[PDB]
Design an enzyme around this catalytic site. Structure first.
Site, PDB file in Angstrom:
ATOM      1  N   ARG B  21     -14.368 -10.017  29.857  1.00 44.81           N
ATOM      2  CA  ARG B  21     -15.088 -10.423  28.648  1.00 44.81           C
ATOM      3  C   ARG B  21     -15.631 -11.845  28.789  1.00 44.81           C
ATOM      4  N   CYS B  42       2.876   4.445  24.551  1.00 42.37           N
ATOM      5  CA  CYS B  42       3.526   4.663  23.264  1.00 42.37           C
ATOM      6  C   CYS B  42       3.232   6.011  22.628  1.00 42.37           C
ATOM      7  N   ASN B 270      -1.133 -20.060  41.479  1.00 37.43           N
ATOM      8  CA  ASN B 270      -2.076 -18.961  41.455  1.00 37.43           C
ATOM      9  C   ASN B 270      -1.518 -17.569  41.189  1.00 37.43           C
ATOM     10  N   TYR B 272       0.458 -15.251  38.321  1.00 34.35           N
ATOM     11  CA  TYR B 272       0.892 -15.108  36.923  1.00 34.35           C
ATOM     12  C   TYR B 272       1.730 -13.839  36.785  1.00 34.35           C
ATOM     13  N   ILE B 274       3.072 -11.103  33.587  1.00 31.81           N
ATOM     14  CA  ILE B 274       2.961 -10.768  32.161  1.00 31.81           C
ATOM     15  C   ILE B 274       3.610  -9.417  31.907  1.00 31.81           C
ATOM     16  N   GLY B 275       3.801  -9.068  30.632  1.00 32.49           N
ATOM     17  CA  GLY B 275       4.373  -7.770  30.310  1.00 32.49           C
ATOM     18  C   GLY B 275       5.884  -7.718  30.414  1.00 32.49           C
ATOM     19  N   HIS B 298      -0.027  -7.347  25.519  1.00 33.75           N
ATOM     20  CA  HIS B 298      -1.406  -7.657  25.127  1.00 33.75           C
ATOM     21  C   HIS B 298      -1.655  -9.149  24.858  1.00 33.75           C
ATOM     22  N   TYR B 418       0.554  -7.471  -6.069  1.00 36.21           N
ATOM     23  CA  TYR B 418       1.264  -6.536  -6.936  1.00 36.21           C
ATOM     24  C   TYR B 418       0.449  -5.625  -7.846  1.00 36.21           C
TER      25      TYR B 418
HETATM   26  C1  LIG Z   1       7.697   6.461  25.992  1.00 32.66           C
HETATM   27  C2  LIG Z   1       7.490   4.974  25.685  1.00 32.66           C
HETATM   28  C3  LIG Z   1       7.373   4.589  24.318  1.00 32.66           C
HETATM   29  C4  LIG Z   1       7.154   3.228  23.985  1.00 32.66           C
HETATM   30  N1  LIG Z   1       6.981   2.880  22.655  1.00 32.66           N
HETATM   31  C5  LIG Z   1       6.692   1.605  22.284  1.00 32.66           C
HETATM   32  C6  LIG Z   1       6.458   1.253  20.948  1.00 32.66           C
HETATM   33  O1  LIG Z   1       6.395   2.115  20.033  1.00 32.66           O
HETATM   34  N2  LIG Z   1       6.141  -0.063  20.645  1.00 32.66           N
HETATM   35  C7  LIG Z   1       6.073  -1.041  21.648  1.00 32.66           C
HETATM   36  O2  LIG Z   1       5.761  -2.179  21.367  1.00 32.66           O
HETATM   37  N3  LIG Z   1       6.316  -0.711  22.934  1.00 32.66           N
HETATM   38  C8  LIG Z   1       6.608   0.567  23.281  1.00 32.66           C
HETATM   39  N4  LIG Z   1       6.820   0.890  24.631  1.00 32.66           N
HETATM   40  C9  LIG Z   1       6.839  -0.248  25.585  1.00 32.66           C
HETATM   41  C10 LIG Z   1       5.480  -0.574  26.165  1.00 32.66           C
HETATM   42  O3  LIG Z   1       4.943   0.633  26.707  1.00 32.66           O
HETATM   43  C11 LIG Z   1       5.649  -1.639  27.231  1.00 32.66           C
HETATM   44  O4  LIG Z   1       6.186  -2.822  26.631  1.00 32.66           O
HETATM   45  C12 LIG Z   1       4.321  -1.981  27.910  1.00 32.66           C
HETATM   46  O5  LIG Z   1       3.771  -0.818  28.511  1.00 32.66           O
HETATM   47  C13 LIG Z   1       4.529  -3.050  28.979  1.00 32.66           C
HETATM   48  O6  LIG Z   1       3.324  -3.321  29.698  1.00 32.66           O
HETATM   49  P1  LIG Z   1       3.441  -3.538  31.285  1.00 32.66           P
HETATM   50  O7  LIG Z   1       2.061  -3.775  31.804  1.00 32.66           O
HETATM   51  O8  LIG Z   1       4.448  -4.561  31.544  1.00 32.66           O
HETATM   52  O9  LIG Z   1       4.002  -2.147  31.831  1.00 32.66           O
HETATM   53  P2  LIG Z   1       3.377  -0.684  31.925  1.00 32.66           P
HETATM   54  O10 LIG Z   1       2.413  -0.477  30.818  1.00 32.66           O
HETATM   55  O11 LIG Z   1       4.513   0.230  32.036  1.00 32.66           O
HETATM   56  O12 LIG Z   1       2.559  -0.650  33.281  1.00 32.66           O
HETATM   57  C14 LIG Z   1       3.265  -0.938  34.514  1.00 32.66           C
HETATM   58  C15 LIG Z   1       2.401  -0.365  35.590  1.00 32.66           C
HETATM   59  O13 LIG Z   1       2.427  -1.050  36.872  1.00 32.66           O
HETATM   60  C16 LIG Z   1       2.638  -0.068  37.880  1.00 32.66           C
HETATM   61  N5  LIG Z   1       3.284  -0.669  39.058  1.00 32.66           N
HETATM   62  C17 LIG Z   1       4.533  -1.106  39.143  1.00 32.66           C
HETATM   63  N6  LIG Z   1       4.809  -1.592  40.369  1.00 32.66           N
HETATM   64  C18 LIG Z   1       3.681  -1.444  41.051  1.00 32.66           C
HETATM   65  C19 LIG Z   1       3.299  -1.729  42.337  1.00 32.66           C
HETATM   66  N7  LIG Z   1       4.185  -2.282  43.200  1.00 32.66           N
HETATM   67  N8  LIG Z   1       2.043  -1.466  42.792  1.00 32.66           N
HETATM   68  C20 LIG Z   1       1.111  -0.905  41.991  1.00 32.66           C
HETATM   69  N9  LIG Z   1       1.434  -0.601  40.720  1.00 32.66           N
HETATM   70  C21 LIG Z   1       2.673  -0.854  40.243  1.00 32.66           C
HETATM   71  C22 LIG Z   1       3.410   1.044  37.252  1.00 32.66           C
HETATM   72  O14 LIG Z   1       3.253   2.306  37.948  1.00 32.66           O
HETATM   73  C23 LIG Z   1       2.805   1.097  35.848  1.00 32.66           C
HETATM   74  O15 LIG Z   1       1.720   2.054  35.703  1.00 32.66           O
HETATM   75  C24 LIG Z   1       7.066   2.236  24.992  1.00 32.66           C
HETATM   76  C25 LIG Z   1       7.194   2.639  26.374  1.00 32.66           C
HETATM   77  C26 LIG Z   1       7.394   3.986  26.701  1.00 32.66           C
HETATM   78  C27 LIG Z   1       7.499   4.363  28.190  1.00 32.66           C
HETATM   79  C1  LIG Z   2      -3.185  -1.844 -18.717  1.00 36.55           C
HETATM   80  C2  LIG Z   2      -2.837  -3.128 -17.926  1.00 36.55           C
HETATM   81  C3  LIG Z   2      -2.633  -3.020 -16.523  1.00 36.55           C
HETATM   82  C4  LIG Z   2      -2.297  -4.165 -15.763  1.00 36.55           C
HETATM   83  N1  LIG Z   2      -2.046  -4.016 -14.407  1.00 36.55           N
HETATM   84  C5  LIG Z   2      -1.655  -5.064 -13.633  1.00 36.55           C
HETATM   85  C6  LIG Z   2      -1.352  -4.896 -12.276  1.00 36.55           C
HETATM   86  O1  LIG Z   2      -1.323  -3.758 -11.742  1.00 36.55           O
HETATM   87  N2  LIG Z   2      -0.935  -5.995 -11.536  1.00 36.55           N
HETATM   88  C7  LIG Z   2      -0.840  -7.255 -12.123  1.00 36.55           C
HETATM   89  O2  LIG Z   2      -0.445  -8.211 -11.457  1.00 36.55           O
HETATM   90  N3  LIG Z   2      -1.145  -7.411 -13.421  1.00 36.55           N
HETATM   91  C8  LIG Z   2      -1.530  -6.381 -14.188  1.00 36.55           C
HETATM   92  N4  LIG Z   2      -1.808  -6.583 -15.562  1.00 36.55           N
HETATM   93  C9  LIG Z   2      -1.767  -7.988 -16.052  1.00 36.55           C
HETATM   94  C10 LIG Z   2      -0.400  -8.418 -16.549  1.00 36.55           C
HETATM   95  O3  LIG Z   2       0.054  -7.432 -17.464  1.00 36.55           O
HETATM   96  C11 LIG Z   2      -0.572  -9.792 -17.193  1.00 36.55           C
HETATM   97  O4  LIG Z   2      -0.992 -10.723 -16.176  1.00 36.55           O
HETATM   98  C12 LIG Z   2       0.731 -10.282 -17.807  1.00 36.55           C
HETATM   99  O5  LIG Z   2       1.144  -9.364 -18.838  1.00 36.55           O
HETATM  100  C13 LIG Z   2       0.542 -11.643 -18.431  1.00 36.55           C
HETATM  101  O6  LIG Z   2       1.737 -12.064 -19.080  1.00 36.55           O
HETATM  102  P1  LIG Z   2       1.595 -12.873 -20.452  1.00 36.55           P
HETATM  103  O7  LIG Z   2       2.951 -13.185 -20.941  1.00 36.55           O
HETATM  104  O8  LIG Z   2       0.636 -13.969 -20.258  1.00 36.55           O
HETATM  105  O9  LIG Z   2       0.895 -11.834 -21.422  1.00 36.55           O
HETATM  106  P2  LIG Z   2       1.427 -10.481 -22.077  1.00 36.55           P
HETATM  107  O10 LIG Z   2       2.429  -9.843 -21.183  1.00 36.55           O
HETATM  108  O11 LIG Z   2       0.224  -9.681 -22.437  1.00 36.55           O
HETATM  109  O12 LIG Z   2       2.156 -10.899 -23.415  1.00 36.55           O
HETATM  110  C14 LIG Z   2       1.388 -11.622 -24.413  1.00 36.55           C
HETATM  111  C15 LIG Z   2       2.168 -11.427 -25.681  1.00 36.55           C
HETATM  112  O13 LIG Z   2       2.117 -12.527 -26.626  1.00 36.55           O
HETATM  113  C16 LIG Z   2       1.771 -11.996 -27.901  1.00 36.55           C
HETATM  114  N5  LIG Z   2       1.098 -13.022 -28.726  1.00 36.55           N
HETATM  115  C17 LIG Z   2      -0.145 -13.543 -28.563  1.00 36.55           C
HETATM  116  N6  LIG Z   2      -0.409 -14.445 -29.501  1.00 36.55           N
HETATM  117  C18 LIG Z   2       0.683 -14.494 -30.268  1.00 36.55           C
HETATM  118  C19 LIG Z   2       1.029 -15.223 -31.387  1.00 36.55           C
HETATM  119  N7  LIG Z   2       0.140 -16.100 -31.901  1.00 36.55           N
HETATM  120  N8  LIG Z   2       2.242 -15.091 -31.994  1.00 36.55           N
HETATM  121  C20 LIG Z   2       3.181 -14.212 -31.524  1.00 36.55           C
HETATM  122  N9  LIG Z   2       2.881 -13.453 -30.413  1.00 36.55           N
HETATM  123  C21 LIG Z   2       1.673 -13.590 -29.797  1.00 36.55           C
HETATM  124  C22 LIG Z   2       0.971 -10.752 -27.650  1.00 36.55           C
HETATM  125  O14 LIG Z   2       1.021  -9.831 -28.740  1.00 36.55           O
HETATM  126  C23 LIG Z   2       1.654 -10.169 -26.404  1.00 36.55           C
HETATM  127  O15 LIG Z   2       2.671  -9.193 -26.686  1.00 36.55           O
HETATM  128  C24 LIG Z   2      -2.170  -5.446 -16.366  1.00 36.55           C
HETATM  129  C25 LIG Z   2      -2.381  -5.548 -17.793  1.00 36.55           C
HETATM  130  C26 LIG Z   2      -2.699  -4.400 -18.549  1.00 36.55           C
HETATM  131  C27 LIG Z   2      -2.880  -4.563 -20.073  1.00 36.55           C
HETATM  132 CL   LIG Z   3       5.219  -3.128 -15.798  1.00 41.11          CL
HETATM  133 CL   LIG Z   4      -0.361   3.633  23.467  1.00 42.84          CL
END
Ligand SMILES: Cc1cc2nc3c(=O)[nH]c(=O)nc-3n(C[C@H](O)[C@H](O)[C@H](O)COP(=O)(O)OP(=O)(O)OC[C@H]3O[C@@H](n4cnc5c(N)ncnc54)[C@H](O)[C@@H]3O)c2cc1C
Ligand SMILES: Cc1cc2nc3c(=O)[nH]c(=O)nc-3n(C[C@H](O)[C@H](O)[C@H](O)COP(=O)(O)OP(=O)(O)OC[C@H]3O[C@@H](n4cnc5c(N)ncnc54)[C@H](O)[C@@H]3O)c2cc1C
Ligand SMILES: [Cl-]
Ligand SMILES: [Cl-]
Ligand SMILES: *SCCNC(=O)CCNC(=O)[C@H](O)C(C)(C)COP(=O)(O)OP(=O)(O)OC[C@H]1O[C@@H](n2cnc3c(N)ncnc32)[C@H](O)[C@@H]1OP(=O)(O)O
Ligand SMILES: *SCCNC(=O)CCNC(=O)[C@H](O)C(C)(C)COP(=O)(O)OP(=O)(O)OC[C@H]1O[C@@H](n2cnc3c(N)ncnc32)[C@H](O)[C@@H]1OP(=O)(O)O
Ligand SMILES: [Cl-]
Ligand SMILES: [Cl-]
Ligand SMILES: [Cl-]
Ligand SMILES: [Cl-]
Ligand SMILES: [Mg+2]
Ligand SMILES: [Mg+2]
Lengths: 437, 437
Positions: B21, B42, B270, B272, B274-275, B298, B418
């Protein structure tokens, strides 16, 4: 200290619970304007799809159970309507009695989140999805009206998850979106699988389309088309629940969010803000960031618990913006700055498409991974992944890389876990590094 | 430079390709002692299982195609039998003619890998698995003898993959291993699911069992048991392919491997190596390491290519030992120092068992994640994960964390992707961090 929390869900209930792990003496009270505390926000689309049918998964606790287990008082149907920060009290409206009162605090934690936007039509068949009350209403409406045809408006993750779930439930959804910019957290040219999955299942969709008028079940569209639908679910963005904060001394930005420091403190002493309402900064670049997702709500909940009752040296280090969504057989995940934020940098993009696992290994599917990096320092700026398999794994690894200031070139050094079912000797992540330059 | 490579597979063919690259002028020749270059090491267990049918999948190149596409000469059935290092030539045996000759080089790259060990019995029914020739032989033998009962000796990860594949192909394997240390790269207590999967499918196994004698198809064992088997696949370890190196000036260790520096250089200019044949050191601790896996072959291939024809400041930074295997429904992955190396440190262990994804999302399963850290500096020493889902993702994230000597405490900061199908807001990784104090 006496602790008052506003909002009893992802950030609020979590934070209160984390404080109780460290402090068993402080009084903790949470006010929640709606019916339920601790509902499972992210489970909601799945509840609608009947994928999640056990109620115990839809919400973790009732106020009675939370008090019995953690001695934390939660008052549902109690809406905080003003923060009187100079007197250290909040004004609360008990919605059951329609009477208000002041509750004092030593520490105040704001986790009000966001509300769903509405298109504003006067329609009884239209619903938005933000909480368990909404979820129950949608389920009940489907049953009461024998709903078959549903219009899903919007194409962000919420809408997409809702569409998938309605389809799995056996309904017939149609998706529309006002533009062609679907699933915006993902690069625009990496979302085609969304459209392919719709086509494959013959689920209709129209982009650059909007509801123009509603007359009962007759829906007239911008395109001029007229169709009949049994139900409409609108996923047209959200807005911060901060109007009740405006009169106080707490600093809000022009979009209505609360900027906080790394201890999740607001500009006012003893008042914290976490969750979707809070803005911070990226961890890897010096730019502001807002990531309204669950991870951030939970992480901030833990940091604030340490600040108040634990090791106050523990501070946030910023967001990376990791996000993800499932759509049928695909996963779409990304992390880092948003597509629109890339322009703030001199950057380059590198990408690779390869099987998620060994090419000779069964059930393989092509995974597309893209990474953007800063040319000035080689740091990773953003990453995106789309595929049927392995996208979550690649993006979480890149999130960890970004947390560690890794350069794109160092990705050739990532030592992946390799066996045929999982990856390649030179994983997609390593290939990004080799292809960089 | 004239380049000679020994071994045409994971390290060797890859390295030659990587050099091309970068350099289109140098002459490059590879010698491979066996029939095939570039076979898919993987893939072999899967080829035996008929999971990989298309044999085209098991061979990536032929010498003719390699020359056509890369202008690299590969001579198969050519075994390097000696390295004449002072004159810079290698002696090569053409195995088809049994005539030898010398090939000169300016640079020599050794990637000879390892060969399978054999128990040494005089048996025509016993096979080892290392290359495609072996795979072909095994497949041929199964068909020619209508093999059914097969004895699989050895419980290392490759032998386990072979066992699973024999079972899925329809045969009846029995597993034996000389000790109870199966799948040795994984924590011993975490390997129980391997035995559970064998038990679930009524696949017999006996640990601390060995072959005593072979009489035709009658196998007598250490236990005194006598059984008839149609075939035996022995997975009893490997040995380095370094006998052809012993007469040269290259330094080999007592086990026959080649220690190399970070440029993958041997002690001889000269040349390196890795891996699998090369030994190095860990990246995160100061200890020697040998990791005979594909990622390392990577990675070293690319580093040597840069050394010879690219950027010679690129050097190896050591191994982490990331590894993984699939066995039926489970995944077993680990990274870091080996179990027996933990004793060289003062350490603690932290673990969590939680659902892989949201508990309410279908198809969930328990994922066990374990992390060992050094008490002197909180650094992560080793991590292991076992489960039907998500183990590869968590271990790859931890490999990335270790690459940066991240501490266990910092895991609380990991920003996971949230959504319900993928994780939790506080992921298993974050939980390790929270549980470390
Ligand atoms: C089944 C499986 C599941 C995995 N799942 C995850 C996962 O979910 N999440 C995650 O982060 N990691 C996972 N890993 C780990 C990840 O694959 C390794 O961390 C990563 O491949 C390492 O990179 P590498 O280049 O060091 O080795 P590799 O990718 O294994 O490559 C090494 C290569 O160099 C070659 N080689 C070795 N010696 C020589 C030589 N003398 N001459 C020429 N070639 C040679 C080998 O044949 C091989 O092809 C998994 C590994 C396996 C096998
Ligand atoms: C349908 C809906 C969905 C929402 N969804 C999300 C969401 O998914 N995620 C998120 O982060 N936020 C959401 N919100 C916003 C969240 O509800 C408000 O940010 C939060 O309620 C604010 O708190 P508050 O105390 O300032 O107001 P409120 O919880 O509304 O309370 C204010 C209260 O003070 C009272 N009040 C006002 N003036 C007076 C007074 N003079 N005397 C006595 N009581 C009084 C009111 O009647 C009320 O009951 C949503 C709001 C609604 C209505
Ligand atoms: Cl709620
Ligand atoms: Cl993979
Ligand atoms: S949209 C996606 C996010 N959705 C939501 O967050 C939904 C709304 N969430 C909530 O209302 C809160 O998150 C609730 C459900 C009230 C509880 O929050 P916690 O995160 O604090 O959970 P628990 O108290 O229920 O803890 C259960 C298990 O986790 C262990 N744990 C919590 N915190 C820690 C720390 N800091 N360190 C170690 N372990 C920790 C608990 O011990 C416990 O495990 P068990 O198996 O239950 O013993
Ligand atoms: S047990 C698991 C380990 N077993 C094995 O690896 C089996 C034996 N392996 C081999 O014989 C070599 O690994 C072969 C199969 C010859 C492949 O060698 P390379 O790794 O050098 O790959 P290719 O030249 O065949 O390239 C395939 C694709 O990858 C891109 N690529 C390789 N190297 C680089 C670098 N350094 N930089 C950028 N891209 C690189 C190639 O361009 C090519 O992509 P395509 O679009 O698929 O052509
Ligand atoms: Cl005031
Ligand atoms: Cl590609
Ligand atoms: Cl010589
Ligand atoms: Cl050396
Ligand atoms: Mg006032
Ligand atoms: Mg390709």
């Amino acid at each position: 200290p006496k602790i008052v929390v506003v909002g009893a869900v992802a950030g609020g209930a979590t934070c209160a619970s984390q404080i109780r792990r460290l402090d068993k003496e402080s009084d903790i009270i949470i006010f929640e304007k709606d019916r339920d505390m601790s509902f499972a926000n992210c489970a909601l689309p799945y509840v609608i799809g009947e994928v999640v049918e056990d109620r115990r998964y839809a919400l973790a606790y009732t106020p009675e159970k939370f008090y019995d287990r953690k001695q934390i008082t939660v008052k549902t149907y109690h809406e905080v309507i003003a923060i009187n920060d100079e007197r250290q009290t909040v004004s609360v409206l008990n919605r059951k009695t329609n009477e208000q009162f002041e509750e004092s605090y030593d520490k105040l934690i704001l986790s009000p989140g966001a509300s769903a936007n509405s298109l504003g039509f006067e329609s009884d068949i239209t619903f938005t999805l933000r909480n368990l009350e909404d979820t129950d209403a949608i389920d009940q409406f489907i049953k009461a009206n024998q709903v078959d045809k549903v219009l899903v408006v919007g194409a962000g993750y919420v809408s997409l998850e809702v569409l998938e779930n309605l389809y799995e439930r056996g309904l017939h959804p149609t998706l529309i979106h006002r533009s062609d910019k679907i699933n915006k957290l993902m690069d625009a040219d990496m979302n085609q699988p969304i459209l392919d999955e719709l086509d494959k299942r013959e689920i209709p969709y129209r982009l650059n389309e909007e509801i123009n008028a509603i007359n009962g079940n007759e829906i007239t569209f911008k395109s001029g088309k007229v169709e009949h639908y049994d139900m409409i679910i609108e996923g047209v963005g959200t807005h911060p629940n901060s109007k009740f904060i405006e009169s106080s001394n707490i600093k809000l930005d022009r979009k209505g969010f609360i900027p906080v420091n790394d201890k999740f403190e607001t500009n006012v002493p003893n008042i914290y803000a976490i969750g979707d309402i809070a803005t911070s900064h990226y961890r890897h670049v010096d730019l502001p960031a807002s990531v309204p997702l669950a991870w951030g709500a939970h992480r901030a909940a833990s940091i604030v618990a340490e600040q108040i009752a634990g090791n106050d040296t523990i501070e946030f280090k910023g967001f990376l913006g990791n996000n993800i969504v499932k759509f049928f057989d695909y996963t779409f995940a990304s992390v880092g700055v948003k597509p629109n934020e890339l322009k703030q940098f001199d950057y380059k993009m590198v990408e690779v498409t390869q099987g998620a696992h060994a090419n000779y290994y069964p059930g393989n599917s092509p995974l597309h991974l893209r990474v953007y990096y800063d040319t000035s320092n080689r740091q990773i700026l953003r990453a995106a992944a789309v595929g049927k398999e392995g996208a979550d794994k690649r993006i979480d690894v890149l999130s960890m890389a970004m947390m560690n200031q890794l350069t794109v070139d160092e990705l050739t050094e990532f030592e992946v876990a390799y066996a045929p079912p999982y990856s390649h000797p030179k994983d997609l992540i390593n290939m990004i590094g080799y292809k960089a330059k």
